[PDB]
Write an enzyme that holds these catalytic residues in place. Structure first.
Site, PDB file in Angstrom:
ATOM      1  N   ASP A 501       0.840  -1.199   0.000  1.00  0.00           N
ATOM      2  CA  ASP A 501       0.000   0.000   0.000  1.00  0.00           C
ATOM      3  C   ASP A 501       0.872   1.245   0.000  1.00  0.00           C
ATOM      4  O   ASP A 501       1.752   1.365   0.858  1.00  0.00           O
ATOM      5  CB  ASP A 501      -0.845   0.088   1.285  1.00  0.00           C
ATOM      6  N   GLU A 727       3.337  -6.299  13.041  1.00  0.00           N
ATOM      7  CA  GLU A 727       3.446  -6.272  11.579  1.00  0.00           C
ATOM      8  C   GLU A 727       4.815  -5.895  11.015  1.00  0.00           C
ATOM      9  O   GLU A 727       5.263  -6.486  10.038  1.00  0.00           O
ATOM     10  CB  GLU A 727       2.409  -5.310  10.986  1.00  0.00           C
TER      11      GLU A 727
HETATM   12  O1  LIG Z   1      -9.795  -3.011   1.990  1.00  0.00           O
HETATM   13  C1  LIG Z   1      -8.773  -3.763   1.323  1.00  0.00           C
HETATM   14  C2  LIG Z   1      -7.430  -3.210   1.769  1.00  0.00           C
HETATM   15  O2  LIG Z   1      -7.269  -3.458   3.168  1.00  0.00           O
HETATM   16  C3  LIG Z   1      -6.015  -3.074   3.748  1.00  0.00           C
HETATM   17  O3  LIG Z   1      -5.999  -3.574   5.084  1.00  0.00           O
HETATM   18  C4  LIG Z   1      -6.641  -2.839   6.145  1.00  0.00           C
HETATM   19  C5  LIG Z   1      -5.857  -1.578   6.441  1.00  0.00           C
HETATM   20  O4  LIG Z   1      -4.500  -1.903   6.727  1.00  0.00           O
HETATM   21  C6  LIG Z   1      -6.470  -0.891   7.645  1.00  0.00           C
HETATM   22  O5  LIG Z   1      -5.746   0.322   7.815  1.00  0.00           O
HETATM   23  C7  LIG Z   1      -7.956  -0.621   7.426  1.00  0.00           C
HETATM   24  O6  LIG Z   1      -8.127   0.346   6.392  1.00  0.00           O
HETATM   25  O7  LIG Z   1      -8.660  -1.808   7.043  1.00  0.00           O
HETATM   26  C8  LIG Z   1      -8.119  -2.511   5.913  1.00  0.00           C
HETATM   27  C9  LIG Z   1      -8.944  -3.782   5.712  1.00  0.00           C
HETATM   28  O8  LIG Z   1     -10.304  -3.441   5.435  1.00  0.00           O
HETATM   29  C10 LIG Z   1      -4.844  -3.689   2.973  1.00  0.00           C
HETATM   30  O9  LIG Z   1      -3.579  -3.239   3.474  1.00  0.00           O
HETATM   31  C11 LIG Z   1      -4.959  -3.329   1.496  1.00  0.00           C
HETATM   32  O10 LIG Z   1      -3.900  -3.912   0.734  1.00  0.00           O
HETATM   33  C12 LIG Z   1      -6.293  -3.822   0.954  1.00  0.00           C
HETATM   34  O11 LIG Z   1      -6.350  -5.251   0.987  1.00  0.00           O
END
Ligand SMILES: OC[C@H]1O[C@@H](O[C@H]2[C@H](O)[C@@H](O)[C@@H](O)O[C@@H]2CO)[C@H](O)[C@@H](O)[C@H]1O
Ligand SMILES: [Ca+2]
Ligand SMILES: [Mg+2]
Ligand SMILES: [Mg+2]
Length: 758
Positions: A501, A727
């Site tokens: 990300d 993490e």
């Molecule tokens: O929604 C898909 C994305 O989710 C991200 O993971 C978490 C994020 O780290 C957290 O900050 C919060 O926003 O919830 C997310 C999950 O709903 C992943 O890092 C990203 O790559 C996508 O998979």
């Protein structure tokens, strides 16, 4: 022997709030879960909680929420005198144990899991006299705290007026019932969920609002058995009753089942006894962590799965990501292969199929995030379910590791076709320029484009945010440069698709960083990202590609192709095997020709430029945006030549680049967008570190890999303490950040124990 490893993680706690969170919204205690069950337990923290396992953690579809502080806590009376017990409590892999010792009475409580919905408590009481037993419990009232301090004065009942929790009795125990709550980000119930307590003796239960007291008289020493079940639908409640009765009929069968299963995990798992005691405890912690994040089938997910963290704010329930699964399943193949298999099945069970109602243009696509509840688009009310992007191609690698361990041909036969369909999706929906080398990108989605198919973006200048649409418009805006910054949902999704990300290579750089880059003689245009729509000849919008081919995904596809060829060979498909080997070879050629820069001695993404280069490559390597962990992906995956690997390893070992206090972080110190506080622009993750070490070994640098592993073991903060696995790490200080009990950190710490703590 599980008893050799007591308290590897601190599992004590007495929660006072449903959301008893740490600084980053994660539950601040580490309950014990096993067998993929949907409830968990903590150890008593002292006199106030001794006699029970406080903090019943409920996994309410997609979140972890505490139900009670004390619940079914035992007090013992002998002839009207309350027995004042001494407490000793500890965790072992697969169990919680609590011993209560007094002169005339002793109690030994052992808590294990019996089924995917039910934990089993053995309460072994030794006494020279008859006793009166009293169990008590009380449901939580308060909603939310941070670091033990209330965030508001909201109550559970106030915030969720339909929850309407009620306790009822049975002859052998009690239950709590829950009303239907559809709080998308907080609390999700069916209206039919229950928490059931059943015991091997009759108890007399009285209920007073949200408190209970249960009594039993015993004539002397006895072993009592108690089941605890969190059941999420009416169908689960019905089905579990026969299991509960069997458990209470032959509790020894279930206790032995759990003891033996955990002896096997440790026997299979701890294959490096020459490691230090502290290193061994890290492996044991990882095993406990991985198994605790395993969830049995629930809602839309009809297979056992594993999530990134059972205690995580946004990682709990059965929320499942593909590349988390590939990594976890690879690690768990070496000690819990049955569940590794299941986890892989879980992900592919929601692979997009022909005729899909939502995105028929995305056949073969594997959703980024699946969970109990489908999205509104698929008829559910789930807010996490995500089909904006997928993750990188590590699936065949994990499938083949499960085969390597089990040597089960039936497994290869079932997964092969799903792996092939996934491969085909990349080549149809993520290869804009048709050269067989994929781009990261973004699906057609409400987040990325208008209903009519125009790509969304937002122009920012000072306090102005100007939302816009259209690729033609976007190209004009970026050529012109009349803005301070841009927000582009498709760019975010592309970075999510890499799993990294907001990584530098995808154009993510802060205003100050970019200003410094330009002041030093760089062009702002070096950081602009371009996009293209992928459209079929019949007009169907398939998605968007970044006009950029990424060296990590090329490398992952390379190895994925070789594993597919291995599977084709096992399955007597020699022509398909040949085709995947040939595709692999072409990718290696492209990676080495196009993505390797001999000058800076490293690999990078390439742009898809307006015209290809003289050598056929889509464009030059994006050296300007700096070095990242994608640069050693060709080594991990075996695509690199020896000469190129030699060059890359020198950069990896250079303290100017990646050889930092905790080495092999997510951007080199020389990367213009580096920050030690930025998740994927400098912080060190255990997966990318291990990929690096494996890459080094593969090309002859095992000894250097062992030294980096030792440096990691000495500098990564918290590693030898009893805290949960997080993490990532600050590369300069070793300090930890992220969700506690994080699965792929556990996975790769385990494999570091297996491979590099030697
Ligand atoms: O929604 C898909 C994305 O989710 C991200 O993971 C978490 C994020 O780290 C957290 O900050 C919060 O926003 O919830 C997310 C999950 O709903 C992943 O890092 C990203 O790559 C996508 O998979
Ligand atoms: Ca391409
Ligand atoms: Mg030895
Ligand atoms: Mg949604």
């Amino acid at each position: 022997n599980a008893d050799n490893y007591k308290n590897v993680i601190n599992r004590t706690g007495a929660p006072q709030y449903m959301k008893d969170y740490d600084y980053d919204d994660h539950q601040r205690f580490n309950p014990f879960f096993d067998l993929g069950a949907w409830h968990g337990h903590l150890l008593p923290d002292g006199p106030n909680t001794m006699g029970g396992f406080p903090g019943v953690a409920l996994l309410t579809e997609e979140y972890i929420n505490f139900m009670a502080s004390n619940f079914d806590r035992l007090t013992v009376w002998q002839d009207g005198k309350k027995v004042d017990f001494t407490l000793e409590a500890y965790s072992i892999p697969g169990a919680l144990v609590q011993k209560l010792t007094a002169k005339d009475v002793q109690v030994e409580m052992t808590l294990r899991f019996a089924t995917p919905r039910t934990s089993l408590l053995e309460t072994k009481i030794t006494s020279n006299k008859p006793l009166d037993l009293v169990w008590d419990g009380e449901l939580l009232e308060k909603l939310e705290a941070k670091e033990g301090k209330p965030l508001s004065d909201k109550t559970i009942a106030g915030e969720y007026p339909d929850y309407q929790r009620k306790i009822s009795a049975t002859r052998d125990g009690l239950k709590v019932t829950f009303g239907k709550v559809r709080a998308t980000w907080d609390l999700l119930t069916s209206g039919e969920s229950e928490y059931q307590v059943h015991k091997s003796l009759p108890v007399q239960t009285e209920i007073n609002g949200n408190r209970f007291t249960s009594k039993a008289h015993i004539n002397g020493s006895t072993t009592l058995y108690t089941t605890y079940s969190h059941l999420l639908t009416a169908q689960e409640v019905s089905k579990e009753q026969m299991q509960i009765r069997d458990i209470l009929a032959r509790p020894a069968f279930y206790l032995t089942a759990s003891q033996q299963r955990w002896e096997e995990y440790l026997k299979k798992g701890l294959t490096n006894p020459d490691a230090t005691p502290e290193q061994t405890r890290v492996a044991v912690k990882a095993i406990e962590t991985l198994n605790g994040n395993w969830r049995s089938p629930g809602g839309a997910v009809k297979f056992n799965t594993v999530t990134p963290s059972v205690t995580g704010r946004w990682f709990s329930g059965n929320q499942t990501w593909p590349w988390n699964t590939w990594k976890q399943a690879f690690a768990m193949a070496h000690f819990n292969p049955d569940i590794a298999k299941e986890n892989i099945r879980a992900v592919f069970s929601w692979q997009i199929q022909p005729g899909d109602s939502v995105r028929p243009q995305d056949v073969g696509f594997v959703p980024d995030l699946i969970a109990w509840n489908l999205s509104p688009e698929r008829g559910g009310d789930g807010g996490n379910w995500n089909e904006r992007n997928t993750k990188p191609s590590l699936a065949a690698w994990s499938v083949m590791e499960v085969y390597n361990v089990t040597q089960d041909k039936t497994w290869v036969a079932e997964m092969y076709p799903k792996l092939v369909a996934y491969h085909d999706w990349w080549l149809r929906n993520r290869d804009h320029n048709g050269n067989g080398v994929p781009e990261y990108g973004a699906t057609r989605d409400k987040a990325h484009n208008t209903e009519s198919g125009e790509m969304l973006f937002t122009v920012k200048k000072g306090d102005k945010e100007e939302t816009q649409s259209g690729l033609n418009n976007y190209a004009r805006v970026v050529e012109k440069g009349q803005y301070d910054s841009l927000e582009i949902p498709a760019q975010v999704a592309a970075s999510w698709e890499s799993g990294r990300d907001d990584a530098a290579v995808f154009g993510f750089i802060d205003k100050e960083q970019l200003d410094k880059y330009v002041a030093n003689g760089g062009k702002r245009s070096d950081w602009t990202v371009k996009f293209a729509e992928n459209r079929s000849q019949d007009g169907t919008l398939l998605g968007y590609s970044l006009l950029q081919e990424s060296v990590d995904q090329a490398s992952y596809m390379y190895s994925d192709n070789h594993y597919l060829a291995e599977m084709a060979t096992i399955l007597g498909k020699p022509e398909e095997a040949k085709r995947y080997r040939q595709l692999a070879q072409q990718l290696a050629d492209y990676i080495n020709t196009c993505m390797f820069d001999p000058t800076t001695q490293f690999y990078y993404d390439v742009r898809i430029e307006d015209k290809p280069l003289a050598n056929g490559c889509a464009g030059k390597p994006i050296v300007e945006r700096g070095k990242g962990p994608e640069g050693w992906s060709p080594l991990f995956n075996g695509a690199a030549t020896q000469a190129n690997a030699d060059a890359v390893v020198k950069v990896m070992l250079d303290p100017k680049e990646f050889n930092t206090f905790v080495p092999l972080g997510t951007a080199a110190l020389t990367n213009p967008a580096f920050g030690a506080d930025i998740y994927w622009r400098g912080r060190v993750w255990v997966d990318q570190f291990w990929f690096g070490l494996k890459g080094m070994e593969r090309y002859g640098y095992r000894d250097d890999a062992l030294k980096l592993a030792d440096t990691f073991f000495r500098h990564a903060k918290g590693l030898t303490a009893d805290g949960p696995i997080q993490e990532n790490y600050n590369p300069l200080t070793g300090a930890q950040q992220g969700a506690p009990n994080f699965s792929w950190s556990a996975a790769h710490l385990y494999m570091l124990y297996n491979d590099f703590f030697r």
